[PDB]
């Protein structure tokens, strides 16, 4: 849901954003936040404790 | 604490084993009192 | 497997089958042991990596459930017939991407692998290709830097080459200066004022005025000086006369960077540089508040700090190798070699072993031997047997070259004339530029 | 092989599949992994 | 209070011990051979070239106008390192100014260059070719744009030699359409030690001249891997009726000393590598100011102006 | 001395070395090179058919 | 009145103080100031 | 100290069969740094060097609080300052 | 390996409008970006609504 | 950057890799005199916890201890009396008039002075006015096979 | 930036040597050793213009002043 | 002020130490080594207080015979001959 997906590097220096951005981080106030990959216990299956 | 300076620190061996060099800046910047008498009169004129 | 070697080439790929995705977590009974049964995952958000399956030859996606009970033989050589039903495509797959990018990482004491993969992380380099568009606040970037000589192909694969992190130092083993214990060097004086590591950071700082406009009243401030008198005697120095400061003006501590006014005071206010060091100004932008109809209510102030080597300025190879620019020798006062190059930096010997860097003696001759010919000496962990060792082989490398084998290079002191009786080990090793400096 | 088998009883000559039992039966324990470790590593340590 | 009897000091006795040769000798490369002369004034010979003779280069710079990308203090530092050809002694050192600096030029001291390129875009460019040496004008700005402006007397005195830039090659910047460069800087005498821009010597170094010598002659394949083992040309293989394969050592002086045949284990019986101890092999190459025989000709003489200062202010008390 | 510790279910998932040192060690291991993250999921009825 | 620098379409906005901010033929709303000839020394150093 | 932690399966890590008994599975690794040590055996390294990075101030105010005085008396008696004797000599 | 030099130029210079260079690093970064592909399309937030 | 020497490296227990140090100034002439006196560097050579000393020099220093004290080293006159002056380098310390040396170890066919004779010299330079000389016995680390 | 001018170990002036090197890889089918033809002896010369990133001519793409 | 004598020198002027400004090894190992050279020098050693000053201690002792002065003098004339040596070969080598 961004204006860049699929865009070349070429149309992207035509913006200006750099040629091989990256993306994945929400634009929040201008400091690029992003949700950081948290460890939860496995989906569904009935382990012991 | 006033008359106290801070900073990093590197190594030299050339100096002693007791000195620490202190770059002009600190010689500038820490001071302490010192009254005057007869034989140290020419030191303090000349510093000021 | 087979339908999926089917799905990605010519053969119509119509819905799976059964995904690869899928994993067949086959639970063996045993007494004492995990409760045994099938089990069948097809969730997201799991954990999935790709082997090659060795009865066929293709692609096969494994997950952490059948990880514990399959024989993955890690080598083509390793492979025990009967029992080992999956291969690993190359050992190389299982570090990260910035730790697998340490030349010869499996020569070093693991923990300087774990402090060179967190320092790496900390590098003045360069921080991208577009900065005249970024409003960040603190960036770092460096002047001058290059590709390694030594490198793993991962380090051509993803793409690095657009980012590089430090230099080429012509580096020399060696205690002369006596200035490099606890693990400071030296930074050879002419090799750094012909622009050794050189750092700019830039400092971002924003001004609103829509802060100091508490409650009751409607917009006041402005940005430019009240119809009226203005002071010379700094004020018209930088700020040109709408209140924004001269582009490529060097600014001190104790200097003015934009200017203000109230309408019903009528007097105009000001707002001075805090940090403590000369930095210069980029670029100003007159922030557009919102969609439209608005006045200029923010500016974006981009000062260009210079930072050259400065003594105190953490330096530190790919191995963990950190230390502080602690002198930097005169480039005559140096040692030399029959050649004549001045060692860029002198590395003190002490810090080898306790630390087990013997990856670093690796790297040098290998950048000793790349540079020469004109290799980019590839430097992927695993590679090296116990049959013929790296070392022999770069050793050939150099030998026909024209150095000595064991990477030694026969130098002259500097401050005598007369040659040094034993050999001293000179090799281009790459040196990243730290920036833990910042807050002296 | 010759610590662990010395050390659950059986020789170096003795079936895989009895000696699989058998370490299969120790380490769910954590006591006798414990004697386990220690002989094993009193041999490796022998050899460095 | 002991003294050898042999380490005294005899004018006549070292001249005549003294012997110098100059293999090759270029406009930019010479390596020349001297002889008899201990450590210590080889190494101060060295120790003046790299440093201690002067230089033209530029110190300041004013800009006018820079909108590159190259940052600002960048471009004034790249072209401070560039070279300047003129004759390092037609000019007076350039006095130091303290409170009371603006009004410190003259036409003695200093010299004076200038640049100014505004890449606009070319539209003759048939296609999209970003080379772009051909799709924009006045892309890079080389070194050889540094334009020379005399102050005063100056014209008339450089008239037979004039003074440009030696290296008109070099690329000192790089612009696209739009932005453009324009400063002027200025070039004052300096001493190697203070800054690297100031040397004029590209490498000056100096070898002690290796020997090798075989204690036992060797024969056959270990004549072949033997010569193999040093660079072409040092190692003969001997023609012998007698025998087959024989080494000795051509020429010591093309040998780097490697010691590399000291890895072999049977070859370390044959043969030592060892260095005469009273021979130097000096090379040095200049950068774009003097014929390197003025180098090492102008480093001597500092070395006795250094020498005639201290006698000079000794006799005074 | 728990989960800080590198229990060997990780090989070729996250990285073994490449962790921050000091008082975070052993929490935050970032994943391998390869370690993808399946998060499009498919249509199974077939697995029981 | 000032001379400055629309972010995107790069055109010569001519904007006067206490104004409203946007380029006159894109619409944008953000704005560099252009770098002016001033006189300034650096040591080559 | 005993050395490494044997998955559920019993083996010592996804290379080695199960119940493996060689002592490369136990964590005793042949190569030394000069030739390069091979990926089972890099592993096991990690393990034991990131343990010691994992392994690697209020008893300064007890001792201290009511060790304040504690002076050598000039009649060569170490007393708390309050006058009581602790030691004599 | 040699350093990719003329490619390097030729990447800088005329910059890709075919597609980024480097797969790898869209690799890296696909978890998050794909993860919000499926939050969009994939039918995840009518299935939450 | 204030500078200190490497035999206090063991004592702040610091490795000058960034980590810095509170610097202050006695003001009172009280102050400073018991600073130099009683708590001045040069006389805090042994820990409080035993007896053992803490200051001493470090790796570099120590290892070419062991390659010049070792008996296949030998100097000319030059090199000799050069080495000696600077390990002195009476003028900024001072209290010294003039350097004495000894005799050579070997004097024919050409005088050499050994490296045991340097650290004897530098010994002999630093007797004070009337001590007799150092005499002692005791086992160094480098082993004796 | 650009390609730095003066190596730093040697003294030697390479500033000029990246618009004639390069265009010895581009046609001429020589290798690596193409600044062999260069004129660099050392190695402290020769690792400058080899492993050089010529990161300037990827930058000069963002002139804000494009007019376009 | 080019050349001092220290506070260290003997009343008769035999053990001295010159502290010759603005220099470094470049002439004091050339000047030590030519002094050497003369036969009535018991000690001849230079130093440098610390390479961030320009200052090199120098010092000289000798036999009560020929004061120190003397020394310094007639070595520096010697070095300068050296030079003269050296410079003339060099010219009559090359056309
Ligand atoms: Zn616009
Ligand atoms: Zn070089």
């Known amino acids: ?49 | 604490v006033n008359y106290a300076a801070r900073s990093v620190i590197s190594p030299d061996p050339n100096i002693e084993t007791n000195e620490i060099g202190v770059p002009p800046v600190f010689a500038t910047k820490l001071t302490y009192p010192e009254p005057v008498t007869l034989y140290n009169f020419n030191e303090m004129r000349n510093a000021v | ?440 | 092989l010759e610590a662990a088998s010395e050390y659950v009883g059986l020789s170096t000559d003795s079936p895989i599949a009895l000696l699989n039992a058998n370490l299969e039966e120790v380490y769910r324990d954590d006591e006798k992994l414990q004697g386990l470790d220690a002989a094993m590593k009193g041999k490796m340590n022998g050899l460095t | 209070y002991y003294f050898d009897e042999d380490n005294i000091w005899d004018l006549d006795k070292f001249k005549k011990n003294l012997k110098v040769s100059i293999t090759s000798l270029d406009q930019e490369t010479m390596v020349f051979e001297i002889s008899g002369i201990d450590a210590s004034i080889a190494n101060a010979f060295r120790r003046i070239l790299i440093a201690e003779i002067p230089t033209l280069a530029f110190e300041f710079v004013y800009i006018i106008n820079n909108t590159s990308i190259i940052q600002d203090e960048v471009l004034s530092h790249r072209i401070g390192l560039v070279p300047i050809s003129a004759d390092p002694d037609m000019f007076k050192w350039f006095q130091h100014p303290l409170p009371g600096q603006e009004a410190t030029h003259t036409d003695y001291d200093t010299v004076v260059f200038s640049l100014n390129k505004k890449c606009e875009f070319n539209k003759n460019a048939a296609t999209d070719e970003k080379d772009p040496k051909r799709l924009y004008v006045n892309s890079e700005v080389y070194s050889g744009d540094l334009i020379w402006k005399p102050q005063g007397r100056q014209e008339e005195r450089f008239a037979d030699n004039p003074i440009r830039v030696v290296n008109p090659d070099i690329v000192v910047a790089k612009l696209r359409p739009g932005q453009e460069i324009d400063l002027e800087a200025h070039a004052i005498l300096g001493i190697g030690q203070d800054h690297a821009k100031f040397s004029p010597v590209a490498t000056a170094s100096y070898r002690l001249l290796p020997t090798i010598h075989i204690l036992s002659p060797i024969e056959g394949e270990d004549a072949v891997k033997f010569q193999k083992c040093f660079p072409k040309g040092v190692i003969e293989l001997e023609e012998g009726p007698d025998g087959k394969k024989q080494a000795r050592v051509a020429d010591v002086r093309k040998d780097t000393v490697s010691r590399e045949c000291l890895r072999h284990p049977e070859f370390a019986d044959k043969v030592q590598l060892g260095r005469v101890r009273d021979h130097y092999l000096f090379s040095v190459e200049s950068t774009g100011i003097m014929k390197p025989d003025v180098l090492f000709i102008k480093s001597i003489a500092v070395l006795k102006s250094k020498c005639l200062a201290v006698k000079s202010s000794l006799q005074n008390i | 001395t728990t989960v800080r510790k590198l229990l060997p279910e990780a090989w070729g998932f996250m990285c073994p070395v490449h962790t921050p040192d000091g008082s975070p060690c052993g929490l935050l291991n970032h994943l391998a090179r390869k370690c993808e993250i399946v998060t499009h999921p498919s249509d199974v009825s077939q697995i029981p058919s | 009145t000032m001379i400055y620098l629309c972010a995107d379409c790069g055109a010569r906005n001519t904007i006067q103080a206490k104004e409203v901010i946007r380029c006159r033929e894109c619409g944008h709303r953000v704005m560099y100031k252009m770098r002016t000839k001033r006189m300034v020394q650096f040591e080559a150093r | 100290g005993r050395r490494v932690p044997l998955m559920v399966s019993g083996k010592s890590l996804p290379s080695f069969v199960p119940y493996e008994t060689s002592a490369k599975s136990g964590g005793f690794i042949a190569s030394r740094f000069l030739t390069g040590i091979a990926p089972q055996e890099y592993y096991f390294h990690c393990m034991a060097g990131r343990e010691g990075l994992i392994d690697t101030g209020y008893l300064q105010r007890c001792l201290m609080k009511h060790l304040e005085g504690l002076c050598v008396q000039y009649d060569h008696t170490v007393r708390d300052s309050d006058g009581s004797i602790v030691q004599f000599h | 390996m040699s350093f990719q030099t003329l490619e390097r130029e030729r990447t800088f210079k005329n910059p890709p409008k075919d597609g980024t260079s480097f797969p790898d690093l869209q690799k890296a970064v696909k978890p998050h970006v794909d993860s919000f592909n499926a939050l969009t399309n994939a039918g995840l937030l009518n299935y939450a609504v | 950057t204030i500078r200190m020497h490497y035999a206090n490296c063991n004592s702040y227990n610091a490795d000058f890799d960034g980590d810095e140090m509170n610097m202050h100034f006695p003001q009172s002439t009280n102050a400073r005199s018991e600073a130099q006196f009683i708590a001045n560097t040069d006389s805090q050579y042994l820990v409080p916890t035993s007896g053992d000393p803490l200051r001493g020099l470090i790796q570099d220093h120590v290892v070419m201890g062991v390659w010049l004290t070792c008996k296949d080293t030998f100097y000319t006159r030059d090199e000799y009396q050069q080495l000696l002056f600077q390990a002195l380098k009476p003028d900024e310390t001072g209290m010294y008039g003039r350097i004495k040396t000894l005799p050579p170890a070997i004097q024919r066919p050409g005088i050499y002075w050994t490296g045991k004779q340097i650290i004897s010299s530098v010994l002999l330079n630093l007797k004070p006015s009337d001590r007799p000389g150092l005499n002692l016995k005791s086992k160094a680390k480098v082993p004796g096979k | 930036m650009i390609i730095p001018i003066r190596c730093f170990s040697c003294g030697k002036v390479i500033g000029d040597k990246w618009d004639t090197y390069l265009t010895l890889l581009q046609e001429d089918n020589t290798e690596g050793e193409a600044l062999d033809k260069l004129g660099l002896q050392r190695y402290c010369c020769r690792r400058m213009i080899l492993t050089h990133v010529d990161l300037i001519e990827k930058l000069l793409c963002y002139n804000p002043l494009s007019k376009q | 002020e080019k050349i001092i004598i220290l506070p260290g020198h003997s009343a008769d002027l035999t053990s001295v130490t010159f502290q010759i400004q603005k220099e470094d090894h470049t002439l004091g190992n050339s000047l030590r080594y030519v002094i050497m050279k003369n036969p009535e020098v018991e000690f001849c050693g230079y130093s440098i207080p610390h390479p961030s000053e320009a200052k090199m201690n120098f010092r000289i002792q000798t036999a009560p015979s020929t004061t120190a002065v003397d020394v310094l003098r007639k070595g520096l004339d010697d070095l300068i001959d050296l030079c003269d040596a050296v410079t003339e070969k060099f010219t009559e080598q090359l056309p």
Not at chain 3, 13 to 25: M, S, Y
Not at chain 3, 302 to 328: A, N, V, W
Not at chain 3, 391 to 414: C, T
């Open chain 3, 1 to 440: 497997i087979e339908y999926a070697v089917k799905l990605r080439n010519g053969t119509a790929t119509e819905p799976a089958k059964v995904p690869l995705d899928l994993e067949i977590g086959y639970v063996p009974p045993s007494h004492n042991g995990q409760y045994p049964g099938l089990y069948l995952f097809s969730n997201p958000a799991r954990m999935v990596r790709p082997v090659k399956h060795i009865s066929t030859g293709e692609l096969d996606m494994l997950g952490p459930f059948e990880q514990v009970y399959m024989d993955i033989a890690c080598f083509p050589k390793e492979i025990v017939p009967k029992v080992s039903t999956h291969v690993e495509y190359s050992p190389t797959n299982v570090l990260s991407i910035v730790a697998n990018m340490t030349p010869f990482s499996d020569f070093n004491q693991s923990p300087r692998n774990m402090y060179q993969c967190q320092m790496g992380k900390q590098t003045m380099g360069t921080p991208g290709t577009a900065l005249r568009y970024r409003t960040d606040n603190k960036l770092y970037r460096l002047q001058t830097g290059q590709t390694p000589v030594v490198r793993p192909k991962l380090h051509n694969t993803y793409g690095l080459d657009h980012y590089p992190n430090g230099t080429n130092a012509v580096v020399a083993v060696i205690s002369y200066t006596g200035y490099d214990m606890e693990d400071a060097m030296i930074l050879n004086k002419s090799a750094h004022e012909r622009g050794f590591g050189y750092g700019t950071v830039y400092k971002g700082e924003s001004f609103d005025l829509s802060q100091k406009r508490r409650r009751g009243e409607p917009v006041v401030h402005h940005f430019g000086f009240a119809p009226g008198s203005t002071p010379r005697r700094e004020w018209l120095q930088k700020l040109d006369a709408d209140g924004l400061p001269f582009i490529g003006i060097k600014l001190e501590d104790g200097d003015p960077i934009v200017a203000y006014y109230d309408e019903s005071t009528g007097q105009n206010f000001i707002e001075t540089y805090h940090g403590t060091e000369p930095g210069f100004v980029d670029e100003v932008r007159l922030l557009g508040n919102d969609v439209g109809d608005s006045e200029c209510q923010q500016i974006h102030v981009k000062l260009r700090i210079t930072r050259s080597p400065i003594i105190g300025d953490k330096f530190s190879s790919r191995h963990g190798q950190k230390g502080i620019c602690s002198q930097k020798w005169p480039t005559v006062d140096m040692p030399f070699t029959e050649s004549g190059m001045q060692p860029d930096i002198i590395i003190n010997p002490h810090a080898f072993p306790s630390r087990m860097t013997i990856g670093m003696f690796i790297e040098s001759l290998a950048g000793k031997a790349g540079a020469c010919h004109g290799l980019a000496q590839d430097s992927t962990p695993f590679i090296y047997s116990e049959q013929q060792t790296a070392a022999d082989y770069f050793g050939e490398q150099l030998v026909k070259a024209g150095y000595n084998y064991h990477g030694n290079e026969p130098m002259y002191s500097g401050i005598t004339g007369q040659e040094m009786k034993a050999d001293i080990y000179i090799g281009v090793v790459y040196y990243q530029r730290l920036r833990h400096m910042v807050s002296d």
């Open chain 1, 1 to 49: 849901r961004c204006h860049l997906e699929g865009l070349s590097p070429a149309e992207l220096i035509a913006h200006k954003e750099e040629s091989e951005e990256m993306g994945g981080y929400f634009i929040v106030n201008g400091i690029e936040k992003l949700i950081r990959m948290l460890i939860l216990p496995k989906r569904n299956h009935p382990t012991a404790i």
